[PDB]
Amino acid sequence: SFADEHRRLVAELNNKLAAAALGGNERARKRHVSRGKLLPRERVDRLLDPGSPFLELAPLAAGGMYGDESPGAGIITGIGRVSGRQCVIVANDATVKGGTYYPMTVKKHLRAQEVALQNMLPCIYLVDSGGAFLPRQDEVFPDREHFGRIFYNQATMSAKGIPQVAAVLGSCTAGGAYVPAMSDEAVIVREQGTIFLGGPPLVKAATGEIVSAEELGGGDLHSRTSGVTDHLADDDEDALRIVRAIADTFGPCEPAQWDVRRSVEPKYPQAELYDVVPPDPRVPYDVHEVVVRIVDGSEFSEFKAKYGKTLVTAFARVHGHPVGIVANNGVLFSESALKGAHFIELCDKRKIPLLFLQNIAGFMVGRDYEAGGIAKHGAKMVTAVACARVPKLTVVIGGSYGAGNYSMCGRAYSPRFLWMWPNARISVMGGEQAASVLATVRGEEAFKAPIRAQYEDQGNPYYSTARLWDDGIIDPADTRTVVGLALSLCAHAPLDQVGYGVFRM
Amino acid sequence: VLGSCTAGGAYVPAMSDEAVIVREQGTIFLGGPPLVKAATGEIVSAEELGGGDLHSRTSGVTDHLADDDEDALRIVRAIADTFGPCEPAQWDVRRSVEPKYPQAELYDVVPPDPRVPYDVHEVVVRIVDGSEFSEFKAKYGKTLVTAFARVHGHPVGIVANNGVLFSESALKGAHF
Amino acid sequence: SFADEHRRLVAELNNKLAAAALGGNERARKRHVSRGKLLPRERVDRLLDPGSPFLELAPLAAGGMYGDESPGAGIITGIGRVSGRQCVIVANDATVKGGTYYPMTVKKHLRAQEVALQNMLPCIYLVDSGGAFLPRQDEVFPDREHFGRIFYNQATMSAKGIPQVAAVLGSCTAGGAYVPAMSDEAVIVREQGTIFLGGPPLVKAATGEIVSAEELGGGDLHSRTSGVTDHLADDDEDALRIVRAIADTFGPCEPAQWDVRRSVEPKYPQAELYDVVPPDPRVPYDVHEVVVRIVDGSEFSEFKAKYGKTLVTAFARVHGHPVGIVANNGVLFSESALKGAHFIELCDKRKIPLLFLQNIAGFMVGRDYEAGGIAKHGAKMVTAVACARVPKLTVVIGGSYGAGNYSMCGRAYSPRFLWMWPNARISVMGGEQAASVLATVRGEQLSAAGTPWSPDEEEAFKAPIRAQYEDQGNPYYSTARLWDDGIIDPADTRTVVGLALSLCAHAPLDQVGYGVFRM
Structure with a gap:
């Protein structure tokens, strides 16, 4: 039955979610906690107000990527209440390769800040990262959507009066040192958290000076001498208590x-x-x-x-x-x-948020349809979607293919959030179509096989979430609560004026 | 649109943000049957020319098809319930x-x-x-x-x- | 020759313009200048910078109305340069029933002020009016577009920094006393100009006092004692010199x-x-x-x-x-x-003024056209016309009929100016169209009642309908009621439009913004 297959797909989703939530293997989890630290999940949990819901972003990021070396891309991102305020929380998962930034890790960190900006949400960074994944440094470091954009975002959000708060619970090195140094307010755990632009191996290599992490950039050093941090915490729990106290000083929200x-x-x-x-x-x-x-x-x-x-x-x-x-x-x-x-014009003028439920089956094709101007009529909808000032939300409940994606507020149209159901599929076109096209060029079946396979592979919802094309795969039964939760977040960011590009009449 | 709507008066619903029309009762046209006949010789009824079904299914001049006057008013009330925030006193x-x-x-x-x-x-x-x-x-x-x-x-x-x-x-x- | 007919219509128009420009009959004109006053049109001419063009508004107002006792509605309105500044000039024509306000006189005065507001042009009022036309006082006094709106306009325009300057060159009485009193700066001619809220007849009726106009509200009285006026002039020429000097103190213009x-x-x-x-x-x-x-x-x-x-x-x-x-x-x-x-969307985004050349019968008719949504496609165009933030000018070069008028920026869509060619027609539908449609309905009714008509009778029924639309739709009937700002020689179209665009170039544009487009 339909329901039997849905329940099977949901069980598979929940097993993947449970597995990814653990982070690193049991050894790494044991090592993290050995010295008194809380696990990353525990840190998020203790930060939240009791009973607060937590809208988690991109939990299955990097799934099937990097040989599965980095579940959730070694970072936790979501929205929850802290001292009564909705906050975007970003926590480095130090159980996953010491919380090193893989390319998807950067992308995930940045996505959290984008949500923070669009919804005017305070940002809380729980820092514990060993640095960049160097074999792929070219996909981590240099470009506009790479690691440097993290601090561009911190500074520009701070300028807009969106609080930027950091808690340094572990390592924080090289460019990562800017996470706390460019926060409005920073906490660090004594004899645990460290911050340095140049870490000990680099100090040794460059000068011969031999120095411990603690001596070089420990909690006591930065809180008493440098002034890089503003609060010295006894331990993780005390640090989180201090963050909650900081959050309780945040100023007035915009009205609904x-x-x-x-x-x-x-x-x-x-x-x-x-x-x-x-x-x-x-x-x-x-x-x-x-x-x-x-x-x-x-x-x-x-x-x-x-x-x-x-x-x-x-x-x-x-x-x-x-x-x-x-x-x-x-x-x-x-x-x-x-x-x-x-x-869409009506919702825009009446200030009604938009919810797009995608199940694409293409546009109608043929001489009479093109002659009737289907391209310009589709264009009018895309203009409307792109220019609408009301918040938009997108849930892919079926197919998402070609130009239909754009007309139905896909990822490039900046909906506040985009989710997929477990049955969803997304690609430029269907697998059979793509193989038909590349084969007829070649001719003028064993050639078609790897292409039909490619589209099954790439169009799969887990392939999509892994790369942050969407913010997560959801239980169809959770659509209503996820949408309700999202709409309450979006309700307090000031709306722009109504204004459209030229409509091709 | 609860009855006749003709010539320039057709712009009342056409230039509305949202328009209701009563089936087999309301009509809308820029040019009514007499003018259609005078200009082209065609004999056409008001219903055929611009009825509720025609505009609500084909032309898109209207956005809601109502069963009768009471239904049309119920529908307007529902539209009004979607209106956005008022300014403060x-x-x-x-x-x-x-x-x-x-x-x-x-x-x-x-x-x-x-x-x-x-x-x-x-x-x-x-x-x-x-x-x-x-x-x-x-x-x-x-x-x-x-x-x-x-x-x-x-x-x-x-x-x-x-x-x-x-x-x-x-x-x-x-x-x- | 189309051109023989056009040239005939233009010769007729120019004869009507020359006659109306004289104002009152020769007796009236003689009386007016017998005691040293300049004629109204001379007053306008001396106010202007030498060589300045003068864009006159509604010169044939009230044509064929009121038994033609008020040529040009007894008031001169237009735009011209005074000390280098483009100004709206309003001059009461005292040779036409002592500058009395007929209903069209009020409308014409208000039209000038509307133009002043929309283009941010200083207003100069050359006052010489004996009051309202009392038999039609109900069409002059009480409503939103009646005499009271003149002062609402003066005050609100003054609040926006649009100078309001008045020169009292003759009589100024009752509510008309507010023209100079609610001006920012007022000139008055000695032993000639008078201002009072209550004139001598009313003073006598109410209190029995016998008082002359001079004693009651003369130039010396207001310029030395009351402070109702700010400048005392020796004669009309001196008063105009003084207005020119006032205009030279006007502040900076907005940029193009x-x-x-x-x-x-x-x-x-x-x-x-x-x-x-x-x-x-x-x-x-x-x-x-x-x-x-x-x-x-x-x-x-x-x-x-x-x-x-x-x-x-x-x-x-x-x-x-x-x-x-x-x-x-x-x-x-x-x-x-x-x-x-x-x-229209493109012109709006690119800040390109729109010029509408109307010759519009109407929309295509029939089931397939209504089914294709012709009403809503027309609607989109009207939405764009109405909401456009660029200046709009309209010239009716042929027909202006029905919903097509609306779609092509008719008077109700606030084009900065609207003119008509001498051959133009304007009406809810075309004359022949109206006769044909009304005959179609009447013919069907007569058939259904068992008394079908003959070809001759149908034709006898159409003739008065054709006459109605010819009479109510011709440019003289239109321009008399200020549905348009004037009838122009088709050969002047380019000149007039070029002049108007120069005037429209200095009022700040609103933002782009449209009503809902019915897709």
């Missing part, structure tokens, strides 16, 4: 950007989503079955219900927040695109 | 206090004939909350009455004629 | 809102427009023939030349000013409207 109501529960259990969405993307279904189950009171007000019926556009609420749902329901026609662009 | 509103007098006493106090003199204080004292007011320049330019008060908890500055206007009355009004 | 180039002449004489445009709006022609002649160097870059061909959209220049020309070239289709909306 829209009116939030009492949440009203849906008339169906969320597990029934397993019954209505076929895991196989070629089985057709009515996406109304999804919409009716995730919204407050199972009530929605459908815009253009009888026009452009392969796209569903509906006003609803999720956990009391107003939302404009844009959901695929077949192949996109010109009418569908016009409908979507109009609907 | 521009001044502080208090709890309303009732006047000391019945409003029907205004009938006894104001001469119907505008030529007949009377004291406009008699009007002010009856319409304002608690029958209270703070008169500005009460002893100066007395043919104009200027007073601070409240009506239904809202602050108001009442400017009320009480005779022929003099220079002093006007200076007083400008200041107030 | 777009880049102005060196003007390049067209390749063709403007009089060739007479040969190219059929006087009859029903007769088809290529509107490119107009565009090629009015623009600099006879050059233009046409946008979407091969799409929606019944609407012409082209970028060009007129007197060095960039313009986006939107010109009708047949019946409007969905594609024409989509094209117009797009074109």
Whole structure:
């Protein structure tokens, strides 16, 4: 059954999540904790207000990459409440190769800061990293989206009055020394945390001077003499207590950007989503079955219900927040695109956040469809998506292919968050299509085989999350709560003015 | 659109942000049947030319198809429920206090004939909350009455004629 | 010869302009100057910088109205240079019923102030008015667009830093006393100009006092005692010299809102427009023939030349000013409207003023056209016209009928100026169209009632309808009521537009922003 396959895919997801959450192997975990340190997960947990939810970003980053040397890319990122304030938390997982930055580690750290910027969320960095993965230093160090961008972000966010707070719980070396040094306020654990631009081996090599990490950049040195840190903590727990105290001094938030109501529960259990969405993307279904189950009171007000019926556009609420749902329901026609662009203008003017539910089946193809201007009608929707000032959220519940991705607010359209279901697939086109194209050029089956395989491989949701094309794979049954949680985060970043690029009429 | 909508009037729904139309009742066209006939000789009914089904399924001129008037109004109410945040009140509103007098006493106090003199204080004292007011320049330019008060908890500055206007009355009004 | 007819219409227009420009009859004009006053038009002429052009607004206001007792509505309004500054000038024509305000006089006064506001132009009021036309006081006094709005305008314009300057050259009474009293700076001519809220008859009626106009509110009284005026002038010429000196103290202008180039002449004489445009709006022609002649160097870059061909959209220049020309070239289709909306978006982003050349029968009609969403495509264009932040100018060169008027920036869409050619027509629908449509409905009713009509009777029914639309739709009827700012010689189109664009160039533009586009 549909549900049996969904439950199987979810169990597989949860096993992967549990495994990745452990971090390094049992030996490394033993070594981390031997000296009095808390495990990285424990650190995040003790920082959060009791009972606070934690929206974790990119937990399966680097999955199937680097020979699986770095689960979660050796770093933990998410949003949770600290002294009553929502905060982006970034914790180096020192059990995973000493918390070294692989390329995906950098990408993950940066993604957390991007979320912080867009939602005006304070940043808390729990530092414990041995440095860069040197065999791949070219994918870690030099470019705009590499390690240097971390500090660009800290400084520019600080200038905007978004607090930047660091707690140095372990090693912090070379460029990594700028994490605490460029924080507004920094804590360090005595006889445990160290900070230096030039570490002991480099000191030895450059000068012959032989020096311990502690003598070179220990907690006592920086808190008493240099002034690189602002708080000296007894241990990890005391450091986290101090961070919570810092957070309690954060200034006033911006008001909610829209009116939030009492949440009203849906008339169906969320597990029934397993019954209505076929895991196989070629089985057709009515996406109304999804919409009716995730919204407050199972009530929605459908815009253009009888026009452009392969796209569903509906006003609803999720956990009391107003939302404009844009959901695929077949192949996109010109009418569908016009409908979507109009609907987005309405949400934009009424200040209704947008939620895109992607299940792409391409655009309609043929002489009459191109002659009717399908390219310019699709373009009008892309313009609307790209220029909308309201927060956008994207959940890929089925396929995500080609130009349809762009029209439905894919990753390049900067939705505040983008998630995928475990049945989702994403690629420039389908596997059979790509092989048909590269073969006919070659001719003018054993050639097609590795290509059909490539697209199964690359289009898989775990391949996607590994690279941070999305912020995580989610249980379909958790869609409603994840969206509700995200919308409450997005509610306090000031909205830009309405303004669009030229619409090609 | 609950009935006919024609010529330039078709822009009412077409230039609306969101438009409802009643099936087999509402019609919209820039050019109605007589003009279609006059110009081209085509014989076409209003329904065929611009009915609710046509615009809600084909043209996209409308966004909601209603069963009847009551359904169309239900739909408008639902649209209104999606409207965004209001601006905050521009001044502080208090709890309303009732006047000391019945409003029907205004009938006894104001001469119907505008030529007949009377004291406009008699009007002010009856319409304002608690029958209270703070008169500005009460002893100066007395043919104009200027007073601070409240009506239904809202602050108001009442400017009320009480005779022929003099220079002093006007200076007083400008200041107030 | 289309051109014989155009030349005849222009000769008629120029005769009407010359007559209206005289103001009152020769008796009235003689009385006015018998005691040393300059004539109203002489006053305007002496105020202007030597050689300055004068863009006159609504010179044929009230034509064929009020039994023609108020030529030009008894008021002169226009824009010209005073001490180097472009100013809106409003002068009461005291030779026309003592400068009495008829309803159109008020409307014309208000129109001038609207132009002043929209283009940030100083206002100069040359006051000489005996008051309101009392038999039509209900159309002069009480409503939002009546006499009171003159002073709302003075005050709100003064608050924005738009100078309000008045010169009292004759009578100024009742509410009209607020013209100088609510001016920032006021001149008055000694032993000639008078100002009072209550004139001698009312003083007598109310109190029994017998007092002369001079004693009650003369120049010496207000300039020495009351302080209602700020300058005492010896005569009209002196008062105008003084206004010129006041204008020389005006502060800095805003910078031009777009880049102005060196003007390049067209390749063709403007009089060739007479040969190219059929006087009859029903007769088809290529509107490119107009565009090629009015623009600099006879050059233009046409946008979407091969799409929606019944609407012409082209970028060009007129007197060095960039313009986006939107010109009708047949019946409007969905594609024409989509094209117009797009074109307008571009001009808006690029800060290119729009020029609408109207000759618009209407939209294509029929089931397939309504089913293709012609109403919503038209709507997009109207949204773009209404919301555009660039200045807009409209010239009706042919028909202006129905919803097409709206889509092509009619009077309700606040173009900075709107003019009409002598051959133009404007009405809710075309005359022949109206007769034909109303006959179609009446013919069907007569048939259904069992009394079908003959061809002769149908024709007898159409004749008064055609007469209604000819009478209510011709340029003289339009211009009399200020639906437009004037009827122009088609050969002056380029000059007038070039002048107007120069005026529009110094008012700050709003941000780009549109209402919802119904996709």
